[PDB]
Design a protein around this nucleic acid. Structure first.
Ligand SMILES: [Mg+2]
Lengths: 129, 669, 64
DNA sequence: GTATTCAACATTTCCTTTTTTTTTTTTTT
DNA sequence: GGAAATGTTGAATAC
């Protein structure tokens, strides 16, 4: 239900009428049953665990002070060694703490083997610090 | 005693302990005064090249010598026979000079002294605070440091103030031309090294930094106090945090043998200003502008921004009616949005200085059209309040009367202010209150001889030097009052704040176990905090302890919230506290208006609750006067909240009006 | 800017009008000193000319 | 390759966010 | 020429 990222289906329904086909409730139920038969998580014991992570400022600060043990303050470590301007510090502390908390929870898990972070920026050589 | 200042109360040094150093007196006596510029610019550098010098400090001007600090077994040796070198005991130096020597030597006393012969900390301590990456295709950083030094005070006698100025360093390569040569003002400059752990910037002849900004005359600034989230890590990167760090470093390097104690200003009377009182003053203030016609004009060449419409919209937002016009109207209040003054090549091309001389009897105010946008482009309301209040002040000047109520000043007094056209006479203008009309004249030369006679030893502040200061003069008695900025910054209680923030950091380092929170749920059902806590525990996992970042919804305002956090602290989790409260009083000396009548000292600060980030220190102002006791009415002159924008002022209100009168006489004459 | 129905917007603060000078031989887009804020003032001539020219051009393409 | 004093313009605040904070593609010309 | 009040650079001094 977006027109930036999709066709306007309010306009298409006005203009095409019933030439805009739609699979019905019975058909959707049949497709739902078919998809369940191929992805039967519940009868086989697959569990989906969801966490919502906010900023972890103390956790990030402890990690930064471990990264550079003899530096003075974690704000200084962020500025100098990571290369973050004074404007970007709060934003980076926000998006970095969540990423690192998720990574730590992934690693400490016993048998998960394959993580995929999805950020907005790429972590290529332009952000090597 | 009172609020804390950068004025130094006592410098205590165990002189017999300085066993650890050898001090020599380098005397450049004998050589002629003409030979002085020939053979003194390199005297510091010739002393530096001689051997293992820690640092040197230029002595008192009448003594005409350099004090040089060396290791205990080291011996100074210069090849010049004209110079006199004698060993000097540590007790012969003035105490503050010896302290300046020892403050300089701190970086190489903390380290291993690195037996390379050219150790040098000739320039003092520079604590690195911020760094900025250079623009692309350049290496290195722009280092923003805070320098700690002692300087004798100007206004006060035989007293010295500890200073915390910002200093910027830039890489030497930035000032090198493309052909490989460095610029004119980058060659022969002292070169600095950044420490490997990144604390200090110190002198090194192999260094890569010089003490210049990236762009000429550009100013960087370190904020005074930062407590934005009670973060000790952000407190450390402020001037007061650097001062606490320096006080730690001083006793690390020298033990208890060297100590610097700051002075507390005696606290007679300290009144505070609430935002409610300021708003009450301001809403009644603007109402006097209704019964005068206000004109907005836009005389910028190539009118492009239509900022005049923005000014009109902002003015009517404060319910003041105004009209836009193509040209200024004689006899009405006029705002002329003009271009920048330098970009107009001639006076007659500038709208400013033209209608100013044309309409000699008309209130004027000017602005640039960039100065009404924020950084996101929205209208800047503070600018339009400032413009309106400046218009009100100038209208009060022209009408020779007060339009709003002002506190009663002293009776039978004349306000004199010299005007910059330096030991030659200046034009001195006067203001005076008779009945309810303000008179403004220009002082005659017959009067100014009596003023200069009665001012005694203080005549130099008014009749000598660049930027002389205005006076309040009492003609029937010959008594005077001069209001002098001492340059002494007034500090908050930085040590107690530092302890509290360290305790909060230590407390917040732990995550709260679920058992404690469930126990508080069980024990205190009447607390209103319980529902938010249950919601948070429901959202949270069942085993992992709760991080402090989840508590951010629960403030420290309600009594139940305070009881909850105090219970957590009793369980061993010091998570939140109050430091901006007036009960603690840490951020006095940055608030309200302090006024010690007995000593003649006063300062002014912000109003309301202390901001989480404070950018400036309030200076201490001193009242030089000839009274036995200063008249009580003098302190009424500071009870105005519109000379400064919604803030207490540090100059009497008759001097603002007199300044505006002098500014009006620029074009009429 | 114009969506061909409403919500017309012009970068000019002014009311750009369109005048034919027969003393010269020129159509002049001259600027009355109108302010950008009063965009709901009288419809100028330059916008009308551009809209009509667009209509005629698209009419030519459709007729093609 | 000096140290110290000092006068001249910057900066932040203001009846209190500047606002959100990126990488990615086919085809004819 | 937003203001006041604070603050720093560069420059001259300069001992
Ligand atoms: Mg003015």
């Amino acid at each position: 239900d977006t027109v930036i990222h999709n066709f306007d289906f309010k306009y298409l329904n006005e203009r095409l009428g019933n030439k805009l086909l739609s699979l019905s409730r019975e058909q959707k139920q049949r497709v739902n049953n078919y998809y369940h038969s191929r992805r039967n998580y519940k009868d086989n014991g697959v569990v989906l665990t969801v966490k919502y992570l906010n900023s972890r400022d103390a956790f990030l600060d402890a990690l930064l002070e471990e990264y550079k043990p003899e530096a003075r303050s974690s704000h200084f470590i962020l500025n100098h060694y990571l290369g973050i301007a004074e404007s970007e510090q709060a934003f980076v502390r926000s998006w970095l703490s969540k990423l690192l908390a998720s990574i730590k929870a992934f690693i400490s898990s016993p048998d998960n083997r394959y993580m995929l972070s999805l950020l907005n920026r790429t972590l290529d050589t332009t952000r090597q610090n | 005693q009172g609020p804390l200042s950068t004025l130094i109360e006592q410098i205590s040094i165990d002189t017999d302990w300085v066993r650890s150093f050898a001090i020599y007196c380098v005397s450049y006596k004998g050589i002629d005064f003409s030979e002085r510029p020939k053979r003194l610019v390199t005297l510091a550098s010739e002393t530096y090249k001689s051997g293992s010098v820690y640092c040197l400090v230029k002595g008192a001007n009448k003594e005409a010598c350099y004090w040089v600090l060396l290791p205990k077994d080291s011996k100074l040796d210069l090849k010049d026979t004209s110079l006199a070198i004698k060993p000097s005991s540590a007790a012969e130096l003035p105490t503050w000079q010896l302290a300046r020597l020892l403050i300089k030597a701190i970086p190489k006393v903390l380290s291993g002294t690195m037996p390379e012969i050219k150790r040098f900390e000739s320039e003092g301590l520079y604590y690195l605070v911020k760094s900025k990456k250079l623009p692309k295709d350049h290496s290195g950083y722009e280092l923003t440091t805070v320098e700690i030094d002692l300087a004798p005070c100007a206004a006060l006698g035989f007293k010295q103030t500890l200073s915390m100025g910002t200093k910027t360093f830039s890489p030497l390569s930035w000032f090198t031309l493309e052909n490989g040569e460095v610029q004119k003002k980058a060659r022969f400059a002292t070169r600095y090294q950044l420490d490997d752990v990144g604390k200090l910037v110190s002198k090194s002849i192999k260094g890569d930094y010089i003490k210049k900004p990236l762009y000429s005359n550009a100013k960087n600034r370190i904020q005074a106090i930062d407590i934005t989230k009670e973060s000790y890590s952000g407190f450390q990167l402020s001037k007061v945090g650097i001062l606490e760090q320096f006080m730690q470093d001083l006793k690390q390097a020298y033990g208890d043998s060297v100590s610097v104690k700051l002075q507390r200003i005696p606290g007679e009377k300290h009144r505070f200003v609430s935002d409610t009182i300021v708003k009450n003053h301001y809403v009644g203030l603007f109402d006097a502008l209704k019964e005068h016609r206000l004109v907005i004009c836009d005389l910028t060449e190539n009118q492009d921004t239509d900022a005049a419409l923005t000014l009109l919209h902002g003015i009517e937002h404060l319910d003041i009616n105004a009209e836009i016009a193509e040209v200024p109207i004689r006899g009405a209040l006029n705002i002329l949005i003009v271009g920048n003054k330098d970009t107009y090549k001639s006076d007659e091309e500038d709208p400013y200085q033209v209608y100013r001389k044309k309409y000699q009897d008309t209130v004027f105010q000017s602005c640039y059209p960039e100065r009404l946008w924020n950084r996101q482009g929205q209208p800047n309301r503070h600018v339009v309040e400032v413009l309106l209040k400046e218009l009100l002040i100038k209208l009060e000047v022209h009408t020779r009367k007060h339009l709003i109520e002002y506190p009663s000043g002293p009776e039978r007094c004349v306000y004199y202010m010299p005007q910059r056209p330096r030991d030659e006479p200046w034009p001195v203008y006067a203001s005076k209150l008779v009945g309810d009309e303000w008179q403004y004249t220009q002082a005659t030369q017959e009067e100014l001889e009596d003023i200069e006679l009665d001012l005694g030893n203080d005549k130099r502040h008014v009749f000598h030097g660049f930027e002389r200061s205005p006076v309040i003069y009492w003609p029937e008695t010959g008594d005077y009052a001069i209001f002098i900025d001492t340059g002494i910054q007034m500090l908050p209680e930085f040590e107690a704040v530092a302890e509290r923030l360290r305790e909060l950091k230590e407390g917040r380092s732990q995550d709260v176990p679920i058992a404690l929170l469930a126990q508080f749920i069980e024990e205190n059902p009447e607390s209103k905090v319980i529902n938010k806590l249950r919601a948070i525990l429901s959202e949270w996992d069942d085993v992992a302890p709760l991080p402090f970042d989840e508590f951010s919804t629960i403030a420290y305002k309600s009594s139940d919230e305070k009881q909850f956090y105090d219970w957590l602290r009793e369980q061993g989790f010091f998570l939140k506290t109050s430091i901006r409260g007036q009960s603690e009083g840490f951020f006095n000396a940055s608030l309200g208006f302090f006024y010690n009548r007995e000593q003649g000292m006063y300062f002014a600060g912000g109003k309301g609750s202390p901001q989480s980030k404070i950018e400036t220190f309030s200076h201490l102002y001193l009242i030089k006067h000839s009274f036995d006791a200063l008249p009580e009415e003098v302190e009424n002159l500071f009870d105005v909240y519109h000379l400064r924008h919604r803030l207490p002022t540090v100059t009497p209100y008759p001097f603002k009006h007199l300044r505006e009168y002098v500014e009006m006489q620029r074009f009429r004459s | 800017f114009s969506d061909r129905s409403f919500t017309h917007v012009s970068s000019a603060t002014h009311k750009l009008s369109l005048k034919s000078d027969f003393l010269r031989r020129k159509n002049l887009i001259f600027s009355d000193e109108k302010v950008e804020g009063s965009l709901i003032e009288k419809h100028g001539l330059l916008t009308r000319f551009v809209n009509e020219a667009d209509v005629i051009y698209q009419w030519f393409l459709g007729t093609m």
